[PDB]
């Protein structure tokens, strides 16, 4: 029933979050986007972006897709590209986890590592990937397109047409609230459009880590960032094109300790080891449940696995340096060798 791995993208299950549901008197669920074949939520935008470039005649067999990505979008793009007969040129900051870079080279991406840089600096990997697409388009006979996830609204469109419909159908029209953190804004803005189209009374919440500017913008009008977060995949300092015209009904600023407490307990109590953005998202789902009151159904997103972030998110020495909680179980049996 599946002609290729592309047919396994999406249609992900809702997993009940036991301790969060018990604490709030609500039914809280996390959408298991980590069960996508590329192992993250980004498979959805990756498919839609490449299909859009095809339908517009911008990609011909053997063409190249260029993207500035911290990793997940690169993995999703290269998987879809190889299945459909295209190539990828991936600009990634050199600071990202080795596990992510290896996955990209194993899948066949052409990998270009650059130093980390704030968006203000033109050598920021996103702005730089735009100029790389412009450069390669001059010499690629089969096309060279800029995926441009942050500002290509086909990203948002993927979540309008798939994520929101799956959530609407899987909760049997009973969902009361949806909450997610923002990177490009595709997940939150797109799911919100699709959910509110189905029921304008659904409440939408932003979950924002320290060091992002979006909570301040929506609540005070100022794009002001304070502190920093060790979570990765999220944290946005400008209104991207995917965020254009979006306003959340609730907005929460989640400190790292709150998200990590949830993540560490989820490993031990519920057998789930998830990335930093999932801790921010579940923390926001609990906040939303408290504002709505008991008896409601809330859905958030479990964006990727915790594996790829062990050296920081689950590292005692690194966490202690930032005064963050430490996984208790990472803090002497006689082996019964014979002879």
UniProtKB/TrEMBL annotation:
Protein name, per record: Cysteine synthase A
Metabolic or biological pathway, per its Swiss-Prot or TrEMBL entry: Amino-acid biosynthesis
EC number: 2.5.1.47
One GO molecular-function entry: cysteine synthase activity
A biological-process GO annotation: cysteine biosynthetic process from serine
The entry's keywords: Amino-acid biosynthesis, Pyridoxal phosphate, Transferase, Transit peptide
Stored Gene3D superfamilies: 3.40.50.1100
Cofactor: pyridoxal 5'-phosphate
UniProt source species: Brucella suis biovar 1 (strain 1330)
